[PDB]
Amino acid sequence: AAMAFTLADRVTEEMLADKAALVVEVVEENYHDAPIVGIAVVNEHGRFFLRPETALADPQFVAWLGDETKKKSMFDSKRAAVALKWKGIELCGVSFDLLLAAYLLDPAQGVDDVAAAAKMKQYEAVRPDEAVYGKGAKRAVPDEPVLAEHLVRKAAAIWELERPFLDELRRNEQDRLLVELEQPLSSILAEMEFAGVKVDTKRLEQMGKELAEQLGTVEQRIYELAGQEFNINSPKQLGVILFEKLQLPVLKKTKTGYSTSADVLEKLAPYHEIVENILHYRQLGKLQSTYIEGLLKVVRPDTKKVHTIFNQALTQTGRLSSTEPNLQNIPIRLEEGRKIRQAFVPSESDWLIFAADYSQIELRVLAHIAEDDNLMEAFRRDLDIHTKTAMDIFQVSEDEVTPNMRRQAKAVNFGIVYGISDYGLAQNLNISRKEAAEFIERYFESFPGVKRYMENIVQEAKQKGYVTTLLHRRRYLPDITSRNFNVRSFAERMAMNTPIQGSAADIIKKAMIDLNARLKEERLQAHLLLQVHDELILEAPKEEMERLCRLVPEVMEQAVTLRVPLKVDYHYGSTWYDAK
DNA sequence: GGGATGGTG
DNA sequence: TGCACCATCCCT
Ligand SMILES: OC[C@H]1O[C@@](CO)(O[C@H]2O[C@H](CO)[C@@H](O)[C@H](O)[C@H]2O)[C@@H](O)[C@@H]1O
Ligand SMILES: *Nc1ccc2c(c1)Cc1ccccc1-2
Numbered sequence: 001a002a003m004a005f006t007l008a009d010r011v012t013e014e015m016l017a018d019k020a021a022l023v024v025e026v027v028e029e030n031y032h033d034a035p036i037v038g039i040a041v042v043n044e045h046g047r048f049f050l051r052p053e054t055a056l057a058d059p060q061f062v063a064w065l066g067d068e069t070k071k072k073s074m075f076d077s078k079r080a081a082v083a084l085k086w087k088g089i090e091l092c093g094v095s096f097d098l099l100l101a102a103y104l105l106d107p108a109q110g111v112d113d114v115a116a117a118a119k120m121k122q123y124e125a126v127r128p129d130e131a132v133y134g135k136g137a138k139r140a141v142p143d144e145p146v147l148a149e150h151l152v153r154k155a156a157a158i159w160e161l162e163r164p165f166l167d168e169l170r171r172n173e174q175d176r177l178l179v180e181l182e183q184p185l186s187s188i189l190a191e192m193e194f195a196g197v198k199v200d201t202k203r204l205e206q207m208g209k210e211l212a213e214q215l216g217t218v219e220q221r222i223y224e225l226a227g228q229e230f231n232i233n234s235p236k237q238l239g240v241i242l243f244e245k246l247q248l249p250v251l252k253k254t255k256t257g258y259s260t261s262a263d264v265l266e267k268l269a270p271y272h273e274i275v276e277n278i279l280h281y282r283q284l285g286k287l288q289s290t291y292i293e294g295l296l297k298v299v300r301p302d303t304k305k306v307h308t309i310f311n312q313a314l315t316q317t318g319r320l321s322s323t324e325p326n327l328q329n330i331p332i333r334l335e336e337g338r339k340i341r342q343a344f345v346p347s348e349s350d351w352l353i354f355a356a357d358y359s360q361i362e363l364r365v366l367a368h369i370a371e372d373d374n375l376m377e378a379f380r381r382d383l384d385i386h387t388k389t390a391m392d393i394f395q396v397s398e399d400e401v402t403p404n405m406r407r408q409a410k411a412v413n414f415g416i417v418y419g420i421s422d423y424g425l426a427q428n429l430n431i432s433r434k435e436a437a438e439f440i441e442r443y444f445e446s447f448p449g450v451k452r453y454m455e456n457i458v459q460e461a462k463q464k465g466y467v468t469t470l471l472h473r474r475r476y477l478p479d480i481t482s483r484n485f486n487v488r489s490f491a492e493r494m495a496m497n498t499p500i501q502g503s504a505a506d507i508i509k510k511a512m513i514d515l516n517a518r519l520k521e522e523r524l525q526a527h528l529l530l531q532v533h534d535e536l537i538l539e540a541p542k543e544e545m546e547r548l549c550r551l552v553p554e555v556m557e558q559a560v561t562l563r564v565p566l567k568v569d570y571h572y573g574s575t576w577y578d579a580k
Numbered sequence: 581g582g583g584a585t586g587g588t589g
Numbered sequence: 590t591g592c593a594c595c596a597t598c599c600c601t
Contacts, residue, residue, distance in 0.1 A: 234599060235584055256583065263590090286586060289597055317593060319589085326595045329588035337587080362589090362592095411590090418592040427590035489591095497592045501589090505593095533589040533593085 003125070005040075005047035005152040007144075011055060014045035016064040021159035022072040023151045024080035024091075027133055027141055030324055031079045032193070032307045033086045033300075037141050040151035042159045049148040056089065068092040073162045075099045075114050075154065077183075078312065081190045098158050100182045101165040103313035104174050108476060111313070114154040121164050126153040173472050181471060181506070182312065184513050189310045189320070192528050196305035197327065198347040200575075201296060207339065208292040215284045218277055225274040232281055235260045246272055263427075283336065291331060291340045298325050305347065310531070317498050318473045318505040319533060328532045330576070341577035346539045354526070354545065355579040356552045356570040357535030360385055361504045362417050365470075368562040369499055372449025379564040386410040392446035393439055412443060416450060417500055419493025423486055454496050461495035469502035470560065471510070507566075508534060511559035518555050522547070537576070545572055 008015070020043035028034040039050040055061050064070050065084070073096040074080060081091045102111040102120060111117045115128040132150045133139050141147060169175045223229045226245070230237045239258030242248045248268050252259035262279060269275040299306050311321045322328040330344070331337025346352055358364075363385055367375035378388045390401045390409035401409075415425060420440055426432035444451035458480070461467050466476040475498045479491035512531060519526055526540030526548055536556065540548060553568040560566075573579045 231599080233597090236599080254584070259584085261585070282586080286597085290587070290595095294596065311594095315593060319593060321594055323595065326588085329586095329595065331587065333588085357589095415591060418590090421591080424591045493591065501593060504589095535589080 003047070003149060003153055003156060005049055005148070007049050007148055009054070011050065011058040011061045015041055015043075015048050015050070016060060016070065017043040017045055018069065019043060019071045020073070021155040021162070022074050022080075023155045023158070024074075024084065025147075025151055026079050026083045027139075030309060031083045032309070034083055036080075036083055036087075038147050038151050040148070040155040042152065042155040047152050047156060049152055056087065062089055066090040066092050071095045073098070073158050075117065075158055076313075078186045078190045078193075081187065082194055085190065085194045094183065094186075095179075096158075096162050096166070097178075097183055097186060098161060098165065099313050100186065101169060101178055104178055104182065104473065105165070105168060105172070106476060107313070107316050107318075114157050117165075118157045118161060121161055123157055123161060126150075126157045172474065174474070177472050181509055181513065185509050186312060188512055188516050188528065189312060192530065193307050193309055195347070195527060195529060196300075196303070196307040197529050198303075198305050198345050199295070199299050200343045200345050201299055201304055204292055204296055204340075204343040207343070208288065208296075211284050211288045211292060215281070215288060218281045218284065222274060222277045222281060225272070225277060232278065233285070238278065242268070242274075242278075246274065248272060248275075283334070287331070287337055287340065291337070295325055295340075295343075308530075315505075316475055316494075317502040318469060318509075319501065320505075320531060322530075327530050338577065342575045344576035345574070348539075348541075350542050351539050352542050352545060352572050352574060353529075353576050353579045354538045354540060354548050354552065354570065354572040355535060355576070356556060356568050358504075358508070358556065359567040359569055361507065361534045361566070362500050363413060364562065364564050364566060365503045365507075366417060366450065366453075366500050367564050369470075369503065370447075370449040370453035371563065372447045372453075374447050375450060376564050382565075382567065386413060389413055389443070389446075393442040395442075408439075412439060415440075416443065416454075417497060419496035420454065421489040421492045421496075423489040457499060458492050458495050461491070467495050467498050469499055469506050471503070471506035473502050473506060475502070504534060507560050508536070508556070511556040512536065514559055515552065515555045518551060522551070524548075524551075537579075548572070 020041050023040040024036050025038045026034050027037055036052045039052055039055045041048045070093050072094050074094055075098040077094040077097045084091050098114065098117050102109065102117040109120065113129040115126050118126055127150060132142060169178055219232060222232060226241045230241060232238055236257060238260050243250050243258050248271050250258060251267055252264045262282060265275050265279050306325050308322045308325055308327045311323065314321050331340050364379050367379055378385060386406050386409050387398060387401050389412060390405045391398060393409060393412065394405055411428060425436055457467060461477045461480045466474045468474045477491045477495055479487050480495060482488040508531065512528065524540065524544055524547065526538050526544050528536060528538050530537040549570060553570055556568045557566045571579045
């Protein structure tokens, strides 16, 4: 039976109560400068639906929206805040965000709409957004009556579910995680996305022309070596030229056919000159398609800025993710791809890009959590951790660590952090099997605390059903007891890795909150632009660099207090690329 | 729509 | 490889 509500023509006083569930609907996935198709309000006085044109043009409503003393409960408040920012309207007083609450309670549920969240508490008096709006081409805003009842039902669910969700968070000891970390963070992310990052489009296009030339030359040399033309971008067609026409050996197979991964090509290079050209083609093409063309495609012509969206409720570990464009995977490893960063510039004249990153936060966190004496001491001496690990597992002095030894010790360190389960590890060839086990065994001898942690965390995941991070974030691991080898293994690696990666996420998130509070106290113009897991990127007047050199590192290093110190390096320059 | 590929921490 | 992600490209 339909849900009762007032389809208002104008804003009334009872619509501006001091507490309410609010829905400011933005249907476009990318909410930047997007339309708000409708508004719904549910409070002690009743349920209302308001048309955006009138609601957002109503001085009293706009003031209510900006009154921090007028509390609102919402779902994905960042989406509303940003869409409103593009309209010059400030949203304040959001005391509860159902999306963030659901995420903290169980990130595995993949909650991405009110219906999904409500279903967690056996509430189903609301439809999933996809059912209302459709998907892909079919997607569209329905007629007012249908739209209005949907937004009212979503608001009604929020109104009803706030208490139950808050009580469970309290039980889980996640109440402060929501109110003091994720929600305040939501506001900061909104400012970051709204501000955007300036792009030197001319530079990007010039690189594009050059890549097109080199690419043209390479693809031609390839057809020459292959004795025919074909779609090099097709792993299937390329696999036919390589493993059939040229007779190259099949070292790796895929659940489809011939594997042509870079690592596989790396091994085939000695057999024929075409391989290197394929690799070169792959490198240039990746840059052209994803980082030149793909990027230019999302730059706003009027401002030359890109406004990413930081999904704060997706990763299973508590990390953020970035989309359209993804600004968390801009090239840096290879010098040629690194050039791309020269296109990311300050949004104003005489401003500079400032980047600060934690040094080995995962291993420092691991040292803290595992309480390993050897590992904690290593960091207390601020030692090169990879060289130190090499010395221990290979039993040699610092002077005896060769480049390959350090490289191998580094791979071991990533392995420990990713989770050494009883069903992977090896690929990088060279004996593997018994020896890989011997090195890991050597490692656990040098770091007994880490061994204890790995065993304990797995046992704890099985006993409690989940693992937790420093700030009480959790991840349920039901497969921890699966009788399927492979499936159980994944869960074990997750139990070992999540507290590490997740705690690192907790720390940088608090640092962001602490940092913004400091920047405001200091009256600095500097502001956050991006977060890339263990680093923060900002821009500010050149006059502020010196203060930032002392302020940012300090704030980030002091976000939390661990058994080992936290270390943050920093760089700044005229472009993202120069901030090295 | 799925997999294959490759970009980041 | 093994942890956590996202975008482009084929191809059914
Ligand atoms: O607003 C981001 C927020 O919305 C969700 C759905 O509740 O994701 C939507 O928006 C993203 C940004 O455009 C898209 O990538 C995604 O496909 C779309 O469903 C949440 O996952 C997210 O936290
Ligand atoms: N995931 C992973 C696990 C173990 C090991 C590596 C990666 C590289 C390596 C080298 C030597 C011994 C053990 C491992």
